[PDB]
Amino acid sequence: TASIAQARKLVEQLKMEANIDRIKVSKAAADLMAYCEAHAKEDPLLTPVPASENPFRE
Amino acid sequence: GSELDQLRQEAEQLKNQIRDARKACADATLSQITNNIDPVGRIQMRTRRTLRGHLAKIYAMHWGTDSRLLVSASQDGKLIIWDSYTTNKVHAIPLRSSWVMTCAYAPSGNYVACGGLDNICSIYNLKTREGNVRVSRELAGHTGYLSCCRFLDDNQIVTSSGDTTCALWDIETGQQTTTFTGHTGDVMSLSLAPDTRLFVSGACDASAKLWDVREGMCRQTFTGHESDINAICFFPNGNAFATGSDDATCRLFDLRADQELMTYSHDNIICGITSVSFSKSGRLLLAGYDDFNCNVWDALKADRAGVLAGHDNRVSCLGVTDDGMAVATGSWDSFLKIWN
Amino acid sequence: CTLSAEDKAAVERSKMIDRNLREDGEKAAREVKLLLLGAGESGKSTIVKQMKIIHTGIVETHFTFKDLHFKMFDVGGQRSERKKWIHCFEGVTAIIFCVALSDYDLVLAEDEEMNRMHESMKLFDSICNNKWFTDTSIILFLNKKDLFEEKIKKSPLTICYPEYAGSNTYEEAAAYIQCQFEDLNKRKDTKEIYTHFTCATDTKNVQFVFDAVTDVIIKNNLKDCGLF
Amino acid sequence: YDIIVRHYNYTGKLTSVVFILICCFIILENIFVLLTIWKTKKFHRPMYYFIGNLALSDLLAGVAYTANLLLSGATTYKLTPAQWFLREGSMFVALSASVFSLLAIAIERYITMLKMKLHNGSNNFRLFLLISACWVISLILGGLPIMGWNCISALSSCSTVLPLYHKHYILFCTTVFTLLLLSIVILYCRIYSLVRTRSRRLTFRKNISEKSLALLKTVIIVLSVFIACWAPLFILLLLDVGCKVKTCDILFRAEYFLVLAVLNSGTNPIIYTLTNKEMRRAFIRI
Amino acid sequence: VQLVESGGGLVQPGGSRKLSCSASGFAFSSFGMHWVRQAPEKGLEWVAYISSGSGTIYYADTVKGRFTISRDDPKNTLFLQMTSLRSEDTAMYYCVRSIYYYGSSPFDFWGQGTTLTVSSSDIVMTQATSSVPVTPGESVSISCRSSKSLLHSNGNTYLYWFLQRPGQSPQLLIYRMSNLASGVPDRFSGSGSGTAFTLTISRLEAEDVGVYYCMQHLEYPLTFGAGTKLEL
Ligand SMILES: CCc1cc(-c2noc(-c3cc(OC)nc(C4CCCC4)c3)n2)cc(C)c1OC[C@@H](O)CO
Ligand SMILES: CCCCCCCCCCCCCCCC(=O)O
Ligand SMILES: CCCCCCCCCCCCCCCC(=O)O
Ligand SMILES: CCCCCCCCCCCCCCCC(=O)O
Ligand SMILES: CCCCCCCCCCCCCCCC(=O)O
């Protein structure tokens, strides 16, 4: 047989993955929202900038 | 026979335990938390430049570090390096095999890699003593077709081939250093971390895994898609990423909490997604749909906020620049456009 | 005007680059590109070897005949999913197909109930009815005929095809196989299927390929100017 | 204002609602055909630009004809000779632009069929040259009678079917139309013979004729519709030079002869759209 | 990379030979070529220039309409022809290449040069001094003043800087403001404001001594400086 080796490898990989730490979804969502709100000033995508500073003027 | 059976049931029990551990850590969704914020009204983007000159389909492009130069690969066998400001061309690098599906631009601005269907990643030099461009290295260690490759450094490059594997290369020596295995389907998308320490790969069977370049092992795996994955891009923070798909659905996963956060699906779209990229602050999630137009899906509201419908054929590649000054979309009509 | 001294020189470089691109774009647009497909033991090697030659992954073959440059793409080393890299071959003049007549009494490897002829028929049905190859004609080649004669003279054809009323002769069996391969074509008003039996003469096969390519070119020219 | 009544007295010239109706129908059908090409991004090759030019010329022809019909009547007696010349000049430039655009379509077809270029990409220089040439030639042909051959000095030199127009200008337009028709017939006969002779001898062995039979039908339909609808006006303008004045009857009721020539221009888009399958499907979608 | 020149000697006024140089070691078909004349114990000035592919050809105002120049792509040879001769044309001629694209460094490699003897509005660039004694290991600042603001609307200036070694051709150090060329040490540095420019050297050794020349490129009539000599 040859699939026993890959089966043991998959079992070991799943066992190694199951031992990782987990964080509540509320904390991750709050961190993402805080990061998105903190850097909202230096984002020239959603914040309109006058044509006097856009290098891609037409 | 019995050993295989007990191994299978142990794997199933471990998967069930992982599922319960992932379900126990879920208390509130992203939509309920991000409900007391002011959403963006409309994102109206008008084209500025129309970089023309290609004579076939366009399959990939990458923005330079200086946010001024970009390289685009096409089927006719050219690797033109455009100038975003003045529309001029800088180089017209020819190719050995005119079947390319990827291209990259080194962070130092010296080298430019371009793989393709010949399962060979060719690295070109742009700062030679002469006036032309030479092939610095020709990496050939993949069996399946090459899909996408990004420069990890000026001397190391990581590639994602179609033979269910990804490998890290060494340009100086010429042989691969670490081989990442574990995927069941074709790997056809990846993206490097901002600190260049980890990266994820998008398989062809509803799966996405996270790898580390030092140990060369699989840390986490993410599921939830229906058809497959087609494009991946990291969040500017470095703890999230968005994965496109073929069933008109792109979702947002998280690294610290290995669980799906939010999905961006609409009842009017029934077509696949080719490219996904975030914004400078991670608020706008541009997606390139294969129904001849793109979308400006919001990140924290899961609603559409604009349509960049100025294209003729399917868009196949698009990326937001480094400083967030403009975006560029390249479709199959041999026309690049710079929106702002 | 507003451009500086050396900026005007950078604009002249872009014009030369564009001129070099347009010059090479008119050279690669006057050569015929045609894809080659087939099964594992469909004799693609013998077909690509018997033709004249001028020239791991895709293998390109270049040859000329009657002042026409043909390109032969042999995607046989791609073990990945065909659905992913099939859209880059959308622009192509013809699609050579190779099937073996004598490969109808030999079953698949590591299998006993699946016939390789049915696998070739299924592959042809999937290729001809694909959503990308809806206007590109298909050139079909029956590779082995003498071995098929020697195999059908002793073994009946009813082993592979359970519906057959004719005698165990090649003259009608070849026509039956050809008609069976013709019926697997849903797009009957946008593409044609040119059938040819591969012979020992190397010139005849290249002549047939040239004739089919010329007919496809004439049809495309007629459809171009709105005359058909 | 004395020349108009004098010439009309010396010459002998002293159901229209349906013609305006068919003219409005022609305008509507042609503007529909034009917006079909303009809206769809696929029909942007140099070939369909010729059909768009033909539609634009047909629209001007219909507008000029309905304007001529509205102006024709009792008001033509007190109408100034300048407007009288300008109206006929507009009609002539419209018809000449139509015929020359048809000739340009045939020329481009013969050119694209002579050499197997294998790709629809073509230079716009030839397109622009042909369009500008046909338009300026039609304009010169329409504006020439104002400069010369006005019959202001002559008394019997100008035509009977329409006064103030010399026999020389009518004969010149006759020879021009004859040359254009001959060129059209020659080009289509060649564009058919080429495909007929290339298919039989060089592509002999296919196990796949039908291509040639389908073609000949299109060519004969085009030629039979173009020639049959332009024969009465040609015969009328050729008999007008020979038929003496004060003794010719047919030239008086010459309204239908122009009606057929204008109906040909209106029915041309039907042929140029029902022939190709792509344009028909695009029109069905719209 | 190598550039050798030939076709010089002792000629009489009225007629002369042809100045020809051969290029070997790079892509000559995509480089614009210049010509720089260096008078004996004097300053050097610009002569002519040919664009890539012989598209645009220009001459200096002093020899306008008196010289004939042309390229040769197949054999990689540049020709320069004299029509009329004067008593001041006796000098040393140099043929230097240059390529112009975003991020390029024009005239990085000059060559060797050949000699020639004869038997008998525009931007003015001036140097601060002519010769100054300096001790090894001392930071020196060489200033070159311009008669016009070289700052363009793009945002980058066009003041090039190169050092002349006694006995051979000069070599470029910085091309626009401070960007050091490939092969020069990190000791050299550049700075400016738009009208007054300076160049600072951190460590001074015995291997870097010669004449410093400042050159503008905004206005097309290229003009060099008088030359600042360094004495050990
Ligand atoms: C005698 C009938 C008549 C013809 C024309 C006309 N206006 O133009 C042409 C014309 C004919 C033709 O021959 C077929 N060819 C051309 C050119 C020649 C080259 C290309 C097109 C133009 N006839 C105009 C008018 C007002 C007219 O009478 C109207 C009556 O109401 C008079 O009471
Ligand atoms: C528009 C009607 C009048 C036309 C008058 C000019 C006649 C045609 C002249 C150009 C024909 C084409 C010449 C060869 C072009 C080629 O081979 O590409
Ligand atoms: C006033 C009458 C004008 C008539 C103009 C007739 C022009 C006919 C041109 C026929 C040949 C077209 C170009 C073919 C050139 C080639 O490819 O050999
Ligand atoms: C209805 C009246 C028409 C009058 C004019 C008819 C002229 C027909 C000429 C046909 C010429 C055919 C040329 C064939 C050339 C070839 O053999 O390739
Ligand atoms: C009353 C309308 C008459 C119209 C006549 C149009 C004649 C069409 C001819 C068809 C193409 C014939 C080509 C023959 C060439 C050859 O024999 O060499």
Tab-separated table of C-alpha atoms and ligand atoms in Angstrom, chain D residues 100-101 103-104 107 111 114-115 117 123 126 129-131 133-135 137 180, ligand 2:
chain	number	residue	atom	x	y	z
D	100	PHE	CA	-20.163	56.739	-55.778
D	101	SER	CA	-20.508	55.231	-52.300
D	103	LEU	CA	-18.847	52.070	-56.213
D	104	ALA	CA	-16.532	52.521	-53.211
D	107	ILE	CA	-13.993	48.622	-54.828
D	111	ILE	CA	-9.632	44.726	-52.951
D	114	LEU	CA	-8.207	39.885	-54.373
D	115	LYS	CA	-5.560	39.200	-51.700
D	117	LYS	CA	-4.950	39.322	-46.146
D	123	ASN	CA	-5.346	51.023	-43.204
D	126	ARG	CA	-7.746	54.172	-48.320
D	129	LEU	CA	-9.390	58.764	-49.486
D	130	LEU	CA	-12.322	56.944	-51.099
D	131	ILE	CA	-14.928	58.677	-48.923
D	133	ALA	CA	-13.050	61.547	-53.207
D	134	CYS	CA	-16.623	60.349	-53.723
D	135	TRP	CA	-18.052	63.209	-51.661
D	137	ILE	CA	-16.807	64.500	-56.828
D	180	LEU	CA	-19.815	53.729	-63.015
F	2	LIG	C1	-14.761	56.793	-54.822
F	2	LIG	C2	-15.019	56.517	-56.308
F	2	LIG	C3	-13.907	57.038	-57.226
F	2	LIG	C4	-12.546	56.375	-56.982
F	2	LIG	C5	-11.409	56.963	-57.829
F	2	LIG	C6	-10.060	56.263	-57.615
F	2	LIG	C7	-10.058	54.786	-58.033
F	2	LIG	C8	-9.426	53.854	-56.992
F	2	LIG	C9	-7.970	54.195	-56.654
F	2	LIG	C10	-7.352	53.272	-55.596
F	2	LIG	C11	-7.582	51.780	-55.867
F	2	LIG	C12	-6.687	50.851	-55.033
F	2	LIG	C13	-5.196	50.926	-55.391
F	2	LIG	C14	-4.360	49.793	-54.778
F	2	LIG	C15	-4.440	49.710	-53.252
F	2	LIG	C16	-3.822	48.418	-52.612
F	2	LIG	O1	-3.451	47.513	-53.409
F	2	LIG	O2	-3.767	48.432	-51.353
